[PDB]
Amino acid sequence: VVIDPSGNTYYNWLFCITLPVMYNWTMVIARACFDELQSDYLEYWLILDYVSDIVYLIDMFVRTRTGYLEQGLLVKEELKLINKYKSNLQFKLDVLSLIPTDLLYFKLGWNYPEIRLNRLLRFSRMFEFFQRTETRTNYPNIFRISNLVMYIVIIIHWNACVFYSISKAIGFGNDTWVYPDINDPEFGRLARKYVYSLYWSTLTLTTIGETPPPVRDSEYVFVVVDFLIGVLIFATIVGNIGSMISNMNAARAEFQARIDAIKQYMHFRNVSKDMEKRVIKWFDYLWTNKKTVDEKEVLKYLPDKLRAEIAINVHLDTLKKVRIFADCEAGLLVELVLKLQPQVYSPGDYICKKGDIGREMYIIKEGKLAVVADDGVTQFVVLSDGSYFGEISILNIKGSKAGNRRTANIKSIGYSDLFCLSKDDLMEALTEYPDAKTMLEEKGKQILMKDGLLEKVTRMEGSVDLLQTRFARILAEYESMQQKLKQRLTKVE
Amino acid sequence: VVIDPSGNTYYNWLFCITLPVMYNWTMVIARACFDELQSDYLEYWLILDYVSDIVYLIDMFVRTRTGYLEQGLLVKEELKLINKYKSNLQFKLDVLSLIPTDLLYFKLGWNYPEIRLNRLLRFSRMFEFFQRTETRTNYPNIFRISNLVMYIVIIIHWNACVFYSISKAIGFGNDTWVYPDINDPEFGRLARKYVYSLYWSTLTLTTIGETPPPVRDSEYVFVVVDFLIGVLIFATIVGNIGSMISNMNAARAEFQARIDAIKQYMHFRNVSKDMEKRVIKWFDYLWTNKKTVDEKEVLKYLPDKLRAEIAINVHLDTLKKVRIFADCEAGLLVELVLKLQPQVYSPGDYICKKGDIGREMYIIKEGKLAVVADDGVTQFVVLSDGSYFGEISILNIKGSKAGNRRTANIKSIGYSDLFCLSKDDLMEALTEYPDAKTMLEEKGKQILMKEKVTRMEGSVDLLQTRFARILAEYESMQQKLKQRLTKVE
Amino acid sequence: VVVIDPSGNTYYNWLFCITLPVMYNWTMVIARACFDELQSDYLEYWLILDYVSDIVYLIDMFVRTRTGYLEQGLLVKEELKLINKYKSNLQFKLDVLSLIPTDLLYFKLGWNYPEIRLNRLLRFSRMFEFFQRTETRTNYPNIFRISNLVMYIVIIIHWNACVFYSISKAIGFGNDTWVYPDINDPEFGRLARKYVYSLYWSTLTLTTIGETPPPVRDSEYVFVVVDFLIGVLIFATIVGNIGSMISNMNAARAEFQARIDAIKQYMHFRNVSKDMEKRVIKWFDYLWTNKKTVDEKEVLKYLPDKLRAEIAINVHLDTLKKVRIFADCEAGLLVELVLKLQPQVYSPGDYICKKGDIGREMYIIKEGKLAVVADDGVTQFVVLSDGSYFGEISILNIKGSKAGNRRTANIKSIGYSDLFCLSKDDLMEALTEYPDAKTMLEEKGKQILMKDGLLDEKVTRMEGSVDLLQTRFARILAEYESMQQKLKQRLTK
Amino acid sequence: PQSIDPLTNLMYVLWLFFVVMAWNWNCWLIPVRWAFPYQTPDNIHHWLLMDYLCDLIYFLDITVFQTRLQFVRGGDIITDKKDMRNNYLKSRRFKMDLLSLLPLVNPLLRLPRCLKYMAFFEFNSRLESILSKAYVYRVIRTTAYLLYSLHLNSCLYYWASAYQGLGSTHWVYDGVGNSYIRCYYFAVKTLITIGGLPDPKTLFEIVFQLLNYFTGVFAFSVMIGQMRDVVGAATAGQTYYRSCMDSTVKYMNFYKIPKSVQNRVKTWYEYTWHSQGMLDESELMVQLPDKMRLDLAIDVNYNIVSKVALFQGCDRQMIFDMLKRLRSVVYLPNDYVCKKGEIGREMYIIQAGQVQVLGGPDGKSVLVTLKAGSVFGEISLLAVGGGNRRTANVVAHGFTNLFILDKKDLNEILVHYPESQKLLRKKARRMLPKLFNAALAMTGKMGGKGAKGGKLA
């Protein structure tokens, strides 16, 4: 078995390896800087470290068992996967992560967990898992906020450990800036140590201050560097959150830009107020019902095959229900589906009136269309979704009594979404299907009859070729006669 | 009756239900955490809570009466509306929000208003009202910043109540971090309690600090977490304001980028200074009079039907005022309106010159044009708004001596906005209107005064017969010419 | 004469070698001017470093006289023209002012006034040019822009530290709580302590953090207000730059996510089936995972025809020459055909074409594997790897073909296949300038079809009238010319 | 000047600056005189004189300068006195100037003089128009807004201190010092949320402090957002160029493009960005109005194209269409513009750089060098398709920029102009029917007669 990196199993293992990586990245420095944290729970620490090393070994095994896309196919050969893993820097990082440095517990002592800092080199699994979650979850902004919060918590925790270690190196209680003397009943508790260090780190890394001022030169240097680092951290937080906020309302901002440009044009052109109200209502309908994006530009992002599959899935059944296109070739039907253009109509709008030019055939994807009389209050028949009209008009049939004219008034009762197939689009699709075009014209002629409606030039060119040659014969004879006449005059001279 | 969600009545009810939701979301936790606030005005609180519950019931009735769009039409059937409401999670949220948990007032006492915390579940209704406000208001940025302010104040108020509750649990005045002893007359004032709690919450939630440092471990943990939440909040405020500032200036930034691009192009191309000044003045005129946007790019986002109606409303009367389009079908005029292309000209710009090929019909919309005498210093006639020229050259009239060429020099006196109708667009519209095409040709002929394969083949037959007659005459003339030389010789 | 190319590596190396004395001046001149002990204690080292800086400034001016510039696309190598170009620029005046011998004022003011070397700060343009060239040359623009912003803020903080120390000196050390304390103190009298406390105060004031002794005198209040305003500007600049960088780094992800959610909104709006939605989501996960979201047409659109042709040739020339019909084609025709190739990417299981589908394009397999399958698709006849092709005869449009630009086999993508299609219209557009090569291509296709056994109006109408009209004018002209000879013959007698 | 242009008159910009200074004096000194006791009866005459000067500036603005401003109605400038006066009286600026000029000793009675803010906006527009790189002025203006907000905060803090008594508590201003820089220091530590101030004690002080920290959080957010927008807009073009360059480099690295081709592409990218400041010029050209683009194309290439003898006598609009269809291509040094033997399709106009025509024995000899403004290869335009080949090797001496017109674009132009198309076919036939048939008939008659006469004899 070879684990697909794009599968759910790979994601589950990414979480299962991210847990020991986060455990190391926090608690290794936590135990290194706080000696009491390492010493008080030493058996628990040893059990967790052994478990984390086991999970690291299983992660290396998964790396040897993770396929990669070569020639578009997952590589399932074990030797190829092993060679691909060992060729990468990740193999060196994982080997350095699992160096048995724990034998230095017998040399340096049990209170030196800095030897496990090599386990931090497995950060690649943690970052890869966070990227996969960002590209996977349905709530990108919530997860991105949570991830940023976790990054800041980890950084502030590391800074707290650094501050406590600096206080330890200088000496607890030696001055006001460092952590106070740890023989105190209150400040000598490990929980108090960590919470005060975390408080100091949060104060300094979030551009707040209000810590005891530094006394020694090293403390002043560390406070300057740490406040600059906190300024960078805060600016990074603000930049990430502002980028997220800009991304959330990017669609709203661009939609408002389109509406504002339309309003600018309508105030420019002195458009009537009722038309402006209808435009505003239409844009509100687009935003409320999540119809803001146009179908053409959205489908341009998809590849030609995927766009064709999407179009087929949307329109193939309702195109096959059309009587002229019922018995047609699959490729022609696919091309006609790809040639469909959406059209959305507000309630009370007219799809076509009597006497209009019929050059397109409409498919009712959704909505209701009413066949109305001249007054518009009487309804003949209501056309529901999947219905169609104007199929005869797009067929250029000779002898039609109703040539390219609409014989009925079609009114949109509500917000009807329609797809139109123009005559030019049908002709272009039928260029590559001549027999299909001929049988389409024959079927349209049959429908019209059922419904009560409905090389001499080349031969003359050869004569014209002979006519020009015969006409040039007299011109050559005139030149010959002129030469003879001029010579006769010259001889007589 | 069924309430249209897009209507004004639905917005009015959204406001009328958001007021109890905001009231609950603030004052329920305010009374839960400040026992003096709940005890002092209990009659008022009870009245407002009963009113809020009644408005919640009317909101449930409205949601039963609120229609939705199915097949592009509003559903007015009571059974479908009730089933759609009950199928949604919002009906469950409303039911859990309207459980009579006020019966616990008789058990736990009158100083436990957290039993009404289930009323907070109408947060989605409040958020929907704010969404409708930001999609309806004429000041999107003002409402956006006020909505951000309101959310920040709500979170700050909740954290103030949390801080007061934490101080109460630890003990008032037990140490320096908590709220001081409420037995003191100055610190025991309810207004003082809430105002100092709000002050502490705003200080802690906006990376300000300026608060007494925590003493106990739980205080340290709460302050650290609160500082992290406040970093998030203040960064959110900065990001929201920065996004708003970018949104207001986005059009100006795009125009200024276009200015910089065209200026860089003119410096790189060694464009003459007069042309550079003309371009800069043209761009400034377009921006100050709100014209700089391309009409095609603006109008392409509208649907074809709305774009057609707007184009009709703008151009139908001024296209019907044309003498060649005075008597035409409505559909042909609508199509010719749709084929109109806007053009803009600087002062002194030449729309057309004498001897130029005339293929476009120009209609003046918001400009003034003149006819000059090849020198630009004198004007025969000034063409005002609504005038047109080139209506003959776009028609293919046979026998036109001055056809396909411009006989007049058209100069833009100032900034003129014209709409051009090309000959190709007119012919494309006239493909579907043959009788209108013949009428247009006849009208152009009258203005200017004041089967094909078989026909072409038969036409060559007459030419061949005429060529035979000329050849037969030339053969007779050749023999006479030779006989003429015979007489001399 | 030897001329340094400003685009070369030598110019960048000299930019670094002149930036080092410029940075040294911009820090240590004000450091020694404000801290008298820093100037006095290391006076010989400062004199040596100032002499070295002046020498490097002289060499910088010499390089500026030898630095070529692109005039009409050519690097200018004329030394007089280069010298005149340098002298006409303001940089020559700045370099002259920066090397004014103000060090002779040490004999008039003493060694305690190194403010005379403040003119050396006018070489800041070399530093800025080196940093912008580093920004355009590095592979980590965001990391380097972090570094550049941080070091600029550190320089400004150091300058404000020097200013604060000078102001404390002017008011008096230890006069009140705000100023630097009395320098007779054993701890606060140390030069390192002086600089580091000044830096601490400057960092806390320029980062708008505070936590410093409040001012006492009105002049101190004015300076604190002004320096906090400078800190507001600095903090806004830092956060804005980092936010802009974060937005730039997240712009590609934001655009890709906007496209993904737009397509998701479309798919929910058109009620696309769940299987098709999952296929689209899997395709976009593949696109972002493999970093294939870029569009070749959009990426290469700005490039000129020659450079785009060179890139496209280096990608496709060997494989297009491996095609049998295009084996003997001209190099220019091959360049055009390669330029007209369009990338197509297919998911695993996708069908590139089906039997009976219209064949208008010829596919080139760049990456991936394709399979020829039967009608059911379970069995495979042959597997086409990278560098293979099919449909080369369909684009040729050989008259007498049994297929008639129709596919005769089912091509299925086994995995993710990167194909390059050459459409029929693109082939004729390339062949417009190669008629002999077009005839050779038709002959080659005819030969392949013969080996495979697969081989078995108005313009003339107007031409006849136009030729007759042209001949009538010539016949009238010929008769008129012959009439002159007939008239002369009558006059001859 | 009897009539003054509100857009391009520097003296009008100076008068606008004077009006802005008067409005700034009013805005910055009304809360000072309202809150601080600086308006003493001893020095009240300075305040009265400067207020009278500001009111005089307002009066000569509303009556003199504003009535002479020329405006636009239907795209035409109006210089008429009565029409300008009617336009200004109709406008809302007259309404605001009338509202401000109303007098309504109390400094708060000077309040509606702050309603003349429109002049400030027009001054800002003029400053952003006259000078390039305007984001530094935007930064200065936003900093001035922050300074005015801190000024108002300082005045409010002094008012609160006086309301609660000076020195009564630690929070209020104690009463020592300049009395404006102490309250301004409070405003700086408060409205930037720096802190470090004495804590508020009473309810009024806590409410004031709370609101001033809330306003300060939002004002600091406004400052940071304005600076972020300035940074993003200033570096937007460089960011776009870097993104396009990085996308191209990533594309070449994915397809294993060799280092020579990649280096040439990077060289072209850097040269184009450093020379013309944009990767494509047609993207900018299509954004312009059609008349603007046509006039720019004329100003760039009309004299050079009309100097070509091939297109002399053609229609001027066809010349204009070729100018519109010209595309700018940058050729690297030692790049072959025309290789010997390849198909000639393109007409080259040297806008910049040099082009060398190679030849001689074994190549590598410069027959002639063509500088900027010279046109070569125009004969290849008048070809049937495949009928033109480049005779000599043509190479770019340096970074030359050629305006290129291919044969296809010329054909799509020529299908619109029949007379010039016919002239071009005539010129093409001249440089290299009835007469052909007459010569064929004469030769055929002599050939048939020769065979007939030989058989007769």
Curated annotation (Swiss-Prot), chain C:
Q: What is the predominant subcellular site recorded for this chain? A: membrane
Q: Where is this region: Cyclic nucleotide-binding domain?
A: 331-451
Instruction: Show the GO MF annotations.
Output: calcium channel activity; cAMP binding; cGMP binding; intracellularly cAMP-activated cation channel activity; intracellularly cGMP-activated cation channel activity; protein-containing complex binding; sodium channel activity
Query: In this entry, which stretches build a coiled coil?
Result: 457-493
Where are the Extracellular topological domains?
Answer: 38-47, 113-117, 168-190
Q: Does the keyword DNA-binding apply?
A: no
Kindly list the residues the record flags as site (Central gate): 235, 239
Record GO cellular component, one term = intracellular cyclic nucleotide activated cation channel complex
Glycosylation positions in this chain: 175
Q: Where is this region: Ion conduction pathway?
A: 141-249
Q: Where is this region: C-linker?
A: 251-327
Q: Which UniProt keywords apply?
A: Calcium, Calcium channel, Calcium transport, cAMP, cAMP-binding, Cell membrane, cGMP, cGMP-binding, Coiled coil, Disease variant, Glycoprotein, Ion channel, Ion transport, Ligand-gated ion channel, Membrane, Nucleotide-binding, Retinitis pigmentosa, Sensory transduction, Sodium, Sodium channel, Sodium transport, Transmembrane, Transmembrane helix, Transport, Vision
State its location(s): Cell membrane
| Residue sites binding 3',5'-cyclic GMP per the record | 391, 394, 407-408
Q: According to its UniProt record, which reaction does this protein catalyse?
A: Ca(2+)(in) = Ca(2+)(out); Na(+)(in) = Na(+)(out); K(+)(in) = K(+)(out); NH4(+)(in) = NH4(+)(out)
* Location of the region described as Selectivity filter in the Swiss-Prot/TrEMBL record: 208-211
Q: What is known of its domains?
A: The C-terminal coiled-coil domain mediates homotrimerization of CNGA1 subunit. The cyclic nucleotide-binding domain (CNBD) comprises three helices and a beta-roll of eight beta-strands from CNGA1 and CNGB1 subunits. Upon cNMP binding transmits the conformational changes to the C-linker domain of the S6 helix to open the ion conduction pathway.
**Functional summary from the UniProt entry:** Pore-forming subunit of the rod cyclic nucleotide-gated channel. Mediates rod photoresponses at dim light converting transient changes in intracellular cGMP levels into electrical signals. In the dark, cGMP levels are high and keep the channel open enabling a steady inward current carried by Na(+) and Ca(2+) ions that leads to membrane depolarization and neurotransmitter release from synaptic terminals.
Q: Which family does it belong to?
A: Belongs to the cyclic nucleotide-gated cation channel (TC 1.A.1.5) family. CNGA1 subfamily.
Identification of the protein by name: Cyclic nucleotide-gated channel alpha-1
**Protein's organism:** Homo sapiens
Which lineage is the organism of this entry classified under, starting from the top rank?
Eukaryota, Metazoa, Chordata, Craniata, Vertebrata
Query: What stretch of the complete protein does the chain hold?
Result: 151 to 657 of 686
Swiss-Prot record, chain D:
- Residue positions annotated to bind 3',5'-cyclic GMP are 377-378, 380, 390-391
What residue spans carry the region label C-linker?
A: 236-312
* Residue ranges that the UniProt entry lists as topological domain Cytoplasmic: 66-80, 122-133, 233-457
Q: Where is this region: Cyclic nucleotide-binding domain?
A: 316-432
- The residues exposed to the Extracellular compartment are 35-43, 157-179
Where does this protein reside within or beyond the cell?
Answer: Cell membrane; Cell projection, Cilium membrane
> Which sequence ranges are marked TM in the entry?
13-34, 44-65, 81-100, 109-121, 134-156, 180-206, 207-232
Positions binding 3',5'-cyclic AMP in this chain are 390
Site note Occludes the pore below the central gate, residues: 228
Site positions per UniProt: Central gate: 220, 224
Q: Where is this region: Ion conduction pathway?
A: 134-233
Annotated effect of mutating residue 228 to G: Increases channel conductance
| Subunit text | The rod cyclic nucleotide-gated channel is a heterotetramer composed of CNGA1 and CNGB1 subunits with 3:1 stoichiometry. CNGA1:CNGB1 channel binds Ca(2+)-bound CALM1 via CaM1 and CaM2 regions of the CNGB1 subunit; this interaction modulates the affinity of the channel for cNMPs in response to intracellular Ca(2+) levels. The olfactory cyclic nucleotide-gated channel is a heterotetramer composed of CNGA2, CNGA4 and CNGB1 subunits with 2:1:1 stoichiometry.
Notes on the domains: The cyclic nucleotide-binding domain (CNBD) comprises three helices and a beta-roll of eight beta-strands from CNGA1 and CNGB1 subunits. Upon cNMP binding transmits the conformational changes to the C-linker domain of the S6 helix to open the ion conduction pathway.
* Described function: Pore-forming subunit of the rod cyclic nucleotide-gated channel. Mediates rod photoresponses at dim light converting transient changes in intracellular cGMP levels into electrical signals. In the dark, cGMP levels are high and keep the channel open enabling a steady inward current carried by Na(+) and Ca(2+) ions that leads to membrane depolarization and neurotransmitter release from synaptic terminals.
Q: Which disease is it linked to?
A: Retinitis pigmentosa 45: A retinal dystrophy belonging to the group of pigmentary retinopathies. Retinitis pigmentosa is characterized by retinal pigment deposits visible on fundus examination and primary loss of rod photoreceptor cells followed by secondary loss of cone photoreceptors. Patients typically have night vision blindness and loss of midperipheral visual field. As their condition progresses, they lose their far peripheral visual field and eventually central vision as well.
In the record, the note on similarity to other proteins reads: Belongs to the cyclic nucleotide-gated cation channel (TC 1.A.1.5) family. CNGB1 subfamily.
**What is the name attached to this protein's record?**
Cyclic nucleotide-gated channel beta-1
Q: Which gene encodes it?
A: CNGB1
Full-protein interval shown: 645 to 1130 of 1251
